[PDB]
């Protein structure tokens, strides 16, 4: 029986991941902004699920919650960083406040929480850190700059960490979903900047993209499968759409590198 | 007669930025180089007293970014090429990196450059020409032991750059992500570097990264390649510089591709 | 020759109103968070259109903008409070911050601008205050509580003011649009709270409503028609969808009042 | 507690309509928590009903104190069946005379306070699958006139919060009632605080009459019995008008809004 | 007879070797680090003789708390080793006041406060050792080393003055002046390098290389223990040939210059 | 040509003597003191070539303002002399953290900030002098003198590293190491002596006696400084007084002796 | 029945002498000092009748805590001795405001605060002594001694007013006016010297030398204080040492002569 701590557990992937752990017999602590958002999970598993109030934006609260969960449970086996939100807007339209906020949620908060729980994993010689990224963690396009920037920062913190904690048997999994249904599991908040005529043609489609094919329950099962495989992948894309964006981007980056390779190598 | 292109280079007092600034002035461009202390740039201004100016700028200071950007526009009328170069080397285990260290690196490498770019974008747009050159690293696409914070900042800068490029292409604005390896520090000097304490839990992994970051590129050749990239009809999104950068980038591309391929069945199976 | 000040002129309905004013021969000051969005308008009418930077969440900047306009233009004849955003969230899912932020854009901001520009209208004995509301200014439903609350506040500020300034010859018009096409004038900002499964059945359809038939240029022309009438209507609904929502809500309020009237009147001494 | 008894939480319970509601609840065998700024105001009711009535100090303006008081009641009583958001102030003055401070203060009392308190008690109502939220509005919740703009703006906001919430929470068996009284007799129950702005010459003719009106009186005891009838009816009305004045005002305004919509309908519909 | 060692900055490099030597010889060690977790490996290896305590030596109030707590639970500290610090390289002109103050905090003020906290109980016993980890740079400087040398020399002179005062109490004061040690077993300490501008690159470049990298830190830790086990403990213990050479060069040059100018020096009498 | 001297702590001791020697030699002097009135005599004697400016060297803000004002109005500073300071004697355990920090502010942080403020214009011109008033205590210590010596040594080492860095720009760095000087004609800085209990009296007592008092003439010290600055190779250090010379030699001898004593153990750590 | 003595500045000199004489007389002593180290031997030698408490009399909050702590644990204080302080020399013009304020904190405000905290329990009991260690300087001054004299004189007059008020309660107030005492046995108190200004050197120099062997025996001084307190009519003032007696009679002679000379003028100003 593993102890799971899942941030943003009241909606989307977080909720589906939290439900799948309790269903498998694990012990889950789900965090959300409002404890009561997880009232149904807790009332159905009074013994193995707990809801805690946590704003991933609040560093002080992160330290309190990490310490309280460690104190009362003795350990965290799996950390899942799922707290977050959707944001679409032109680079120029994104305010510094909106940019800093998204980084608090997707980067600084998850890093602080991860840092708080890493030592007991290292000391035990086992544990998993599961970071909910996006295909956006490797690529961007019109309207997605702030979002991709935050997810790519998360991804590179994960890559670095993974290399460091492999010796301790710690698994780091970067999950890269595409679009998933929201009727059954809900979703996190979403903000869409004013579209000004200069950007509408480019940014407009990204608004549609973010505003169907994916099953959150099947996603959570694939995450558990990847964690339970001998060699856990560093990244797990989820959805045909995510896969398509990722391969197309790998393709164009390699093409450009080869094209400019002689120039690149000539600066030696 | 033609108006000379106006280059604004941040962290232009040493290293790669000083090579880029030098390249611009020797080619006839007008250069505003920035540094925390203007006196850091005395040698540049002494050499090019008519075409080079030194302005005091801490890229961690958002109010000052806005003041400098507005001041440069007021006196030069425009900025043709913005080079976001300011920054530092940083090495430490993820567990060893303090929140303050992580935040300070994001200020320098992400928030400051984002603010400066937003301030200068509108005049590029209204003119219908301009270049934003963001100095990244092979670490803007990949990471390893001791490099987590650095790679995180550069990847954020790269993704801001990818999004922006897609949005401003219709305006004729060029966005260039530069991904160098290590350069010789002979004439131009070196940028600041911080190395976290290495404890025995991480030393075997983090140790080599410290060495990698400490020390053979030619910064002048690198600076020429940037200018070539900017002068070409199809300006690439990325320009890696140096053999090690290319090797690192190719190895990461391969590893990512191989992993995607292996896991593709599972990835595609999550639909209804 | 009238001086129009239009907030949120950057996109959607605000752009259309400002565009209609200049096409009519008036002088326009359009405000937005960023001036760069209004550049083509200023380019087309360089002597009669100006773009000013204004976040209506910032009380100090409202005061500065208002004073600057009155100094350089001498007056404001028509004030249009249009700045704002669409918002969707279950009541319980709305954080206090999401609630207060919407009240800044739709209520406190407009109230402050209006107070600052009211004295000069009152001294001149003419002026119009045009408050961009919604069918939501009179009614609400799942997912729409915060939005409706802000717009209803704005409508009732407008009702009380209208009665107060009528003797000064000042016009107050509450405009109640449905949804407009935004392929021409650009789409406004939109905020959506976290979605909870327990609420999805109800909030679902509202998200979809917000995320077509209205022509914003026709709406702008309707506003000016209403203003040009000697007895300006207090309210001007725009679009069949808005009229339908409003008549639906008026029907149900009326039926309820009738049903409970005996009990209601019975509570007096 | 008797098996059929209900827990009522009434804000602003020490005087006026809120006092009458609190008193009607105890008389009906219910258990009451009444709040006020000075708890000592409710001493005489607590002494008359030691085990079924409690006074708790609360400024609805104070959101931290809201959360504490709500948690306290739920801990100690186990539930709240009926919440009455009654705390409030009468306020009159010209739009132009009202300070931004006075406006924000009235929004805190009438809108943000109740919103937070409601939000805090809604989940125990949902889990139990029964409960009532009773919001004390005014005829002013649907209409305004000279001197009344701030007060109407706040009541209308509270009403629309209620309308939206009502639609969301009906599936859970939760009742949401908007009460719309006129002025009440004050001889037996007293009244709430009241502020009347300076009336300058330019507004005296319009605002004067509003001051008089706000200052045909309702019977608060019968008004409280009507709230209880409305809540006990299978189809609870969304709105309950109270008094001939409120009914006249509300029906007269619906009439005018409808007539105007009719007159302008061709113009309204023509915007496709 | 077991001794209680308190070693600041004990998790990596030289301090960790000093901690290792102590526990290997049967003494008790309290090692400090900004995070207790940095020391997990030492506590794992020596569960009964090593403890890790969180201490940021730039935090004076935390210094008082940690010293009192150690006394409360161990009853004494026999050997204090002021080891916490960092390497720092940069031109005098490029060094910010903040960077200068932070280095003084780590290398001077923190050590002074901690020493003060722990002296009374050594006086009371009539025994103890204060071991201050300096450098050849505690006696000399050169391009890029100004801030570093300044902090180490201050620590040295505090030490010289203290040694002369506490000798009658049976307290030993040892200034250790190491050169470059191998960092392959216990990791390396933190290091900050300033930007190196063209005006200073030729002079400061070689200093960056010198601190970036021939010495055995295990032998260095043994030499410290030997110097303390000796009836007459030297005031200074240079460690490494490189240290000896730097120190001799500076002695020679200071003496040559004193002599060259001596006639002028002596002619200022009233 | 005529040089511009900025002298901190100009109202007493070496600062006063150096300021008077500069103006007598035809140079221009800006002297600083906490109370400008302390420099009234200087300004009255040389109304056109001396100026008094108020400066507390513990106030970095004020340091910045004064440095900029002097550069703005004089156009340059040729010679910076750091003489601001005070004296303290007391057992290491008697010295409060506050007293310790205050000494470091006066002797180290203040002079460093002022030096950094004036270095670029020296570097740019290719000429200039930095004159730091240290002590034999900048190389050595003993009972009662720990705090003082620690601050002076910090200053010495900042000077060593700086001197090496700016030699290529022709800038002179001069560490002045005086012994005991008469104070009846030039005065001196404030002096504090901690409580001296019987347990420390035998060791600390002699140090109090030594700093309170005599042999040295500050006017002659000022001339020796100007002589060192005017010589082709300026020494990095200038001791002043036979007493300082004996202190410094004795310390060199014992440091060298102990190095040699333990040398085999030292070299034994090499792989 | 042994009395409870609270002695400030018990760490050296006179305060230590007084604390020791009290334990030797069989009394109970609480000695207070910024640092307690010097008192270790007294505490260990008399573990049941001597205690050392850390107290900086400049810190009013700490005065309050310590007064309260002693009253709660011992039940009372019979004899309060205000002895904390330092020596200080400087020309009036060379005395900075901070130097003047610091000396007033030590010699005036702290002692006033401690006395106030302990007076109620004396008043309620109907017995007690307040012993204030002044100086001949509490009545007179001369070059270099103005701050010291000003603080001691203020302490003396607080004492004169207090003595008159608390006489009817049976409380004794004793102003002790010592001259220079030997420091080789009991140790030496802190000493502060203002910046030296050459314009004052001839006047202030001799005073500096005055405070920098000494005739007085602190053990004999302690015995005389005890005798003064044991006497039914305790004198208001007790000079100690021939030097003190001579300074004081010199001052009384001059004040008396000047009063006489100007009496007619003085009395001529009546309405
Ligand atoms: Na480096
Ligand atoms: Na000073
Ligand atoms: Na003395």
């Amino acid at each position: 029986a593993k102890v799971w701590l899942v941030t943003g557990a009241s909606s989307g992937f977080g909720r589906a991941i939290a439900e799948a752990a309790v269903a498998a017999g694990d012990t889950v602590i789900g965090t959300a902004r409002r404890t009561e958002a997880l009232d149904d999970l807790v009332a159905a598993y009074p013994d193995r699920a707990e809801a805690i109030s946590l704003d991933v934006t609040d560093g002080e609260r992160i330290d309190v919650v990490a310490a309280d969960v460690l104190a009362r449970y003795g350990r965290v086996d799996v950390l899942v960083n799922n707290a977050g939100r959707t944001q679409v807007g032109a680079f120029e339209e994104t305010t510094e406040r909106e940019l800093r906020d998204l980084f608090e949620l997707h980067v600084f908060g998850p890093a602080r929480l991860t840092r708080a729980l890493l030592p007991q994993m290292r000391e035990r010689g086992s544990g998993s850190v599961v970071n909910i990224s996006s295909f956006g963690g490797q690529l961007s396009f019109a309207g997605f700059s702030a979002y991709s920037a935050t997810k790519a920062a998360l991804e590179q913190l994960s890559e670095g960490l993974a290399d460091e904690v492999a010796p301790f048997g710690i698994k780091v999994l970067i999950v890269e979903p595409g679009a998933f249904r929201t009727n059954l599991f809900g979703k996190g908040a979403a903000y869409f900047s004013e579209e000004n005529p200069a950007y509408a043609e480019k940014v407009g489609p990204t608004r549609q993209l973010v505003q169907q094919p994916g099953d959150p329950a099947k996603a959570a099962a694939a995450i558990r499968l990847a964690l339970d495989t001998e060699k856990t992948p560093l990244r797990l894309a989820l959805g045909g759409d995510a896969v398509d964006f990722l391969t197309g981007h790998l393709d164009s980056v390699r093409a450009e590198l080869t094209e400019w390779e002689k120039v690149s190598r000539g600066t030696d």
Side-chain angles (χ1 to χ4, degrees), chain A residues 26-33 35-74:
Chain A
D26 289 331
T27 298
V28 174
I29 301 103
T31 77
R33 289 265 275 262
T35 44
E36 303 89 354
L38 288 145
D39 272 3
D40 36 359
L41 183 78
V42 175
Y45 298 82
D47 287 322
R48 296 196 278 98
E50 193 181 325
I52 296 181
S53 191
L54 175 67
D55 189 336
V56 161
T57 264
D58 183 340
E60 260 39 77
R61 187 60 185 171
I62 285 164
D63 300 346
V64 172
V65 170
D68 179 49
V69 171
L70 284 185
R72 290 182 298 95
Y73 293 86

Side-chain angles (χ1 to χ4, degrees), chain A residues 87-91 139-146 148 199-200 202-207 209:
Chain A
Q87 184 165 312
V88 170
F91 176 94
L139 63 102
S140 203
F141 39 71
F144 230 34
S145 68
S148 293
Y199 291 112
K202 284 282 193 168
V203 165
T206 302
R207 185 186 282 242
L209 205 180

Side-chain angles (χ1 to χ4, degrees), chain A residues 117-183 185-186 188-195 197-200 202-209 211-215:
Chain A
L117 296 176
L118 194 59
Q120 58 89 46
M121 296 184 187
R122 181 181 38 73
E123 293 149 2
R124 181 170 52 243
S126 74
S128 291
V129 179
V130 180
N131 291 150
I132 306 311
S133 181
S134 169
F135 54 86
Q138 280 187 245
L139 63 102
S140 203
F141 39 71
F144 230 34
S145 68
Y147 184 82
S148 293
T150 63
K151 293 304 187 176
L154 213 220
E155 292 215 1
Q156 300 300 328
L157 288 175
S158 308
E159 284 202 30
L161 175 67
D163 193 38
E164 294 165 12
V165 300
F168 311 120
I170 292 166
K171 296 167 188 284
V172 181
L173 178 63
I174 301 168
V175 180
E176 296 173 317
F180 282 68
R181 295 259 221 89
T182 82
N183 54 329
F185 291 95
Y191 183 67
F192 296 90
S193 303
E194 191 175 78
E195 292 180 12
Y199 291 112
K202 284 282 193 168
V203 165
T206 302
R207 185 186 282 242
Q208 263 76 79
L209 205 180
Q211 288 176 2
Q212 178 90 302
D215 185 344

